[PDB]
């Protein structure tokens, strides 16, 4: 707290006057801030620093026509005057109209462009968009190139990349390079592609950067300014025309809380009750709940955003038992939806997908991701901002398309992607997807809802909605085809990209400030002074040396292997959640194994496994007899209505909830059914409570129930010996502790933030970059891909043809030159390269020897490659690299190949249709590689091999981008 202001919470007007000037603040407020800031080029001699200023004006001298807000005026401004610019934005900002001014300033004075985006189906409606609207617009991609000679290119980011390694001629007239949704360039993959292609780039290139918010921004014009010596404005906006409040949602939890306020403000109580719902651990029928009270609490539409393909249309069947829409939007739908089908053979429009999909859509449900059609996704994205679906399932990649907002953003998962980490939900990623809430007009708050599992790590929740944001990270590592690309030309090194990429330019501008934060953080630590440093750190230490130690009593007490030998109907028992909520005492009632679950949830650990039936006096919501498997049916102990009542009720508590037994027995009769039954069994209770004021006695551990354990001896051993060092404290006569902790907890965590601050600066001087291309150049001279010169031979020269594909540019360079692919067909030569060419997951049965033995010989060679590889001092294991080959879609392809039908293509494997059509648009690439390929090495026979085969790959309804000129 220290600078800062509160808005009119509802609705206000400050102001007022009569007849001549008033001040307007009608219906909007508080959206305010705006940002300007520019990077410069590094001088070469001392002589002479010019001081050149570019503050550009508000509006353009000319504006083309073009509608202009302030925000996109300036940033439109930096373009008129030509100087590179970043735009840093939500998608409500309407960036994309920069992007159509750059190109429509160099169409006026005739110059060529290159639009360039993240993935290749939204340059194809990029595409259909820029061109109807200037008409001097050709797309390239890997799969089809049309009209090239055009002036204004929208291409692959690969595309873009392969042409300046092989130094097109294109490139000498390129002014001007449009780069989309560049921020995700963090992608661990793919992000290397964007750093490989503004690298290699002509320094007289002027750039136009189109992102999402980032807090660096400045420094990545720094990285801009320096490498390729241009002055690089930056346009920043952190406002959205509708404000955001978030609401948790506890898996298993009743409700949401609001964790979030409209204006800012962070209700941790809220946050904390929310955290306490969830150490209660099927929840996929709570999305099911969800989705259908906001519809009767209005919050529509709603953006469901979840990472899998394949639950996501899960929980669009469990939401196919609802309908949204009404009889006038229920044919709507399908007469909208007709239109495609001229698009489509009738065989196509049978195809099983779209029938499934089609009455989906009549009910208002929608379904988004990469495995769908490309002209199915267009319509359910067509329905959408039409206002004909009221509710969504989208994934990550919807939030990188065009602005289609909602009124609802629900969290169904905040973990992320395999590539390499399981990762919670980064800021940056919050804030894109989030985004989506809140239409400008129509809205008055953004409803965002958030699905929470927890683990050891609560920090993780409060981080990404309550902290700031991520700084931008390079992606960039080394690769084959990049190596080889360097090592190819003379003029240019390998390391000389490693000295551009901005993975060095943050790190080495990173080191001299980040000295700094580990200094001033080291500062109040020490400028914290506690008095008696020491003993606290001894009471807290073992504070929670002892607390947690205990909780490791009750559970080897809680197993069967123990307390269950102790069951007997009667017996006295203490009941306490696994939250650690006391329900108090009880008594046994009866004890009985849970046997066969239904199916699905993995069989029962024996901790949680039994299921206790146990008197208590707690009341609440009455029923849950039948039983959620969680604890307890959802009561609440004598702290809530005690007059409203008070029962001794049999309640069926988990095995988990036991926390001690009693001495001694209630004799018990058969039934307890009604509430008279039960209540004279609880005053029976009450009675040995009035005889034992100090304690119920309780059946000793060790010794009352016979744990002899050396394990179990030790921990109860360890139990002792740390309790007498409790005792050896203020504990007793003084509870000034609280200002003692609190202040205590800042040495601690400041000790823990310095420690992430000095380990910090080690991974800014980190080598792994440099070691790894000594190591992996090591693999090139001995594959005999290069000399002991280290320059490029005939083998390193077909590994730079290959690009679609990142594992095997080597693989498929040994192969070919080993004369592999001339003893095959062309329809085998392709169904085999089908290993390569994508990740995805596929379940058929296939190990026809056929084409088992082509795969087994080059999975072979990948075990080659990796052996020499692996002990050349790089990380690969020789089984892992080995299985990153599908042989699963091997029948799948060959039988395309040969002119079968589309629809019975599908019926051969589980793969999605329209992700079948992006691997095998892929496919066709690496064939068209590969073509190229042979040419270099010499043999043309292969090069018709790879043609012959591609012509088969190539139809009518499988090439589906647009069709123009």
């Given at each position: 707290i220290m600078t800062d202001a509160f808005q009119t919470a509802e609705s206000r007007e400050v102001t007022g006057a009569q007849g001549f000037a008033p001040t307007e603040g009608e219906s909007i407020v508080l959206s305010h801030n705006i940002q300007h800031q520019v990077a410069l080029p590094p001088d070469l001699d001392y002589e002479y620093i010019p001081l050149s200023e570019h503050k550009p004006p508000a509006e353009p001298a000319r504006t083309y026509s073009f509608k202009l807000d302030p925000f996109q005026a300036l940033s439109v401004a930096s373009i008129e005057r030509e100087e590179s610019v970043l735009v840093s934005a939500h998608?409500?900002?309407?960036?994309?109209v920069v992007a159509e001014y750059a190109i429509a300033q160099c169409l006026k004075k005739n110059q060529r462009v290159i639009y360039t985006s993240p993935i290749k189906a939204l340059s194809n409606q990029k595409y259909r968009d820029f061109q109807a609207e200037f008409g001097d617009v050709g797309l390239m991609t890997g799969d089809v190139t049309i009209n090239p000679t055009a002036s204004c290119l929208v291409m692959t980011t690969e595309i873009l990349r392969s042409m300046l390694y092989r130094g097109s001629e294109i490139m000498r007239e390129v002014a001007w390079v449009v780069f989309d949704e560049i921020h995700y360039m963090r992608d661990k993959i793919r992000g290397v592609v964007w750093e490989e292609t503004i690298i290699l780039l002509p320094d007289k290139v002027r750039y136009v950067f189109l992102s999402a918010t980032i807090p660096n921004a400045f420094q990545f014009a720094e990285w801009i300014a320096k490498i390729h010596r241009q002055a690089c404005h930056v346009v920043y906006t952190d406002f959205r025309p509708t404000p955001l409040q978030n609401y948790f949602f506890p898996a298993g939890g009743k409700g949401i809380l609001l964790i979030v306020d409209e204006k800012g403000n962070f209700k941790e109580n809220n946050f904390n009750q929310a955290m306490a719902?969830?150490?209660?651990?099927?929840?996929?029928?709570d999305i099911a709940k969800i989705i259908k009270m906001i519809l009767k609490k209005n919050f529509q539409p709603v953006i469901v955003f979840n990472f899998s393909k394949r639950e996501c249309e899960q929980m669009a069947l469990a939401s196919s038992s609802m309908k949204f829409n009404a009889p006038d939007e229920e044919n709507m739908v399908n007469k909208v939806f007709e239109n495609a089908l001229a698009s489509l053979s009738e065989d196509d429009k049978n195809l099983p997908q779209i029938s499934n999909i089609l009455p989906l859509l009549r009910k208002g449900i929608g379904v988004h991701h990469s495995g769908l059609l490309p002209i199915l996704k267009e319509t359910i994205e067509i329905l959408f901002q039409e206002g004909l679906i009221k509710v969504l399932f989208a994934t990550e990649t919807f939030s990188i398309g065009l602005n289609m907002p909602a009124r609802t953003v629900v969290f169904t998962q905040v973990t992320k992607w395999d590539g390499q980490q399981r990762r919670p939900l980064t800021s940056s990623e919050y804030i894109q997807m989030a985004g989506r809430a809140g239409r400008r007009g129509l809205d008055d708050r953004g409803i965002v809802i958030m699905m929470v599992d927890d683990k050891l790590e609560p920090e993780t929740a409060r981080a990404i909605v309550v902290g700031n944001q991520d700084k931008l990270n390079s992606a960039f590592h080394l690769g084959y085809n990049m190596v080889l690309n360097l090592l190819r030309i003379?003029?240019?090194?390998?390391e000389y990209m490693l000295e551009r990429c901005f993975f060095q330019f943050q790190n080495a501008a990173s080191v001299p400030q980040l000295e700094r934060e580990l200094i001033s953080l080291q500062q109040e630590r020490d400028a914290i002074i506690i008095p008696d440093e020491s003993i606290v750190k001894d009471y807290y230490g073992v504070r929670q040396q002892l607390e947690e130690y205990n909780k490791d009593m009750v559970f080897v007490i809680q197993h069967p292997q123990n307390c269950l030998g102790f069951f007997q109907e009667g017996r006295l028992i203490h009941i306490k959640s696994p939250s650690g909520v006391d329900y108090g005492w009880g008594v046994l009632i009866k004890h009985i194994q849970r046997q066969t679950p239904k199916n699905g949830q993995p069989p029962y650990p024996e901790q949680e496994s039994y299921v206790l039936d146990v008197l208590l006096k707690v009341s609440g919501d009455f029923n849950p007899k039948t039983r959620g498997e969680g604890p307890m049916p959802e009561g609440i102990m004598p702290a809530g209505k005690d007059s409203k009542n008070a029962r001794w009720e049999v309640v069926p508590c988990l095995?988990?909830?036991?926390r001690a037994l009693g001495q001694l027995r209630v004799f018990l009769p058969k039934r307890l059914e009604s509430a008279d039954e039960k209540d004279g069994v609880g005053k029976a209770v009450d009675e040995i409570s009035r005889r034992f004021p100090d304690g119920i006695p309780i059946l000793d551990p060790m010794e009352n129930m016979g744990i002899n354990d050396d394990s179990f001896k030790k921990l109860l051993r360890k139990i002792e010996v740390l309790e007498s060092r409790l005792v050896a404290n203020p504990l007793h006569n003084s509870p000034l502790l609280v200002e003692l902790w609190n202040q205590y907890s800042l040495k601690m965590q400041l000790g823990e933030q310095i420690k992430e601050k000095k380990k910090a600066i080690a991974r800014a001087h980190s080598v792994a970059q440099l070691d790894e291309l000594k190591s992996r150049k090591r693999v090139l001279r001995r594959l005999g891909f290069i000399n002991d010169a280290e320059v490029v031979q005939m083998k390193a020269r077909v590994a730079c043809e290959i690009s679609s594909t990142e594992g095997h540019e080597l693989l498929l360079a040994e192969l070919l030159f080993n004369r592999f692919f001339n003893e095959l067909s062309p329809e085998i030569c392709a169904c085999i390269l089908s290993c390569f060419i994508f990740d995805e997951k596929i379940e058929t049965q296939a190990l026809k020897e056929e084409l088992a033995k082509p795969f087994r010989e080059i999975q072979a060679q990948a075990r080659i490659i990796a052996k020499v590889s692996a002990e050349s001092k790089l990380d690969v294991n020789e089984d892992e690299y080995v299985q990153s080959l599908k042989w699963q879609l091997m029948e799948t392809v060959l039988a395309w190949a040969q002119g079968r039908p589309f629809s019975e293509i599908c019926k051969m494997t589980n793969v999605y249709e329209g992700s079948l059509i992006r691997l095998f648009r892929r496919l066709e690439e690496l064939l068209r590689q590969m073509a190229e390929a042979a040419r270099v090495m010499g043999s043309e026979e292969l090069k018709d091999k790879f043609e012959l085969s591609l012509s088969k790959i190539r139809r009518d309804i499988v090439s589906f981008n647009s069709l123009y000129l």
């Open positions: 998608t409500s900002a309407g960036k994309t719902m969830i150490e209660e651990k099927d929840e996929k029928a003379e003029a240019i090194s390998p095995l988990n909830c036991l």
